[PDB]
């Protein structure tokens, strides 16, 4: 038996702005991720704009590699590499093995795979 839907919740990101790690809402749809500003953890100072989607990822020219040991307080952490030229990269951390494989599956499931013929 086997069930196909849409995998939505939350994750988190390296936030060099604080340098800590806070939590956002993260949906994938299609072949995209698209992240989430603070939810909680809202740093706002005059409180700006803030909208839904923050960011989001092509997932189309990028590459996942499971960082090891974590990163930054971190024991399990995933970093993301763009393939368009000279971006920046993105670390992501959880705080299970089952939401890790989870989430970071599914976003190799449409970088680290692409079936195209």
Request: proline share 4%; charged share 30%.
């Amino acid at each position: 038996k086997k069930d196909e839907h849409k995998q939505q919740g939350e994750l988190y990101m390296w936030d060099s702005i604080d340098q800590k790690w806070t939590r956002h809402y993260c949906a994938i749809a299609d072949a995209k991720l698209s992240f989430s500003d603070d939810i909680e953890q809202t740093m706002e100072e005059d409180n700006p704009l803030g909208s839904l989607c923050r960011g989001i990822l092509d997932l189309n020219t990028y590459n996942v590699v499971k960082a090891p040991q974590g990163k930054n307080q971190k024991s399990f952490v995933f970093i993301l590499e763009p393939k368009q030229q000279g971006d920046p990269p993105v670390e992501f951390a959880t705080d299970r093995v089952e939401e890790l494989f989870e989430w970071f599956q599914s976003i190799r499931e449409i970088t680290w795979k692409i079936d195209t013929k």
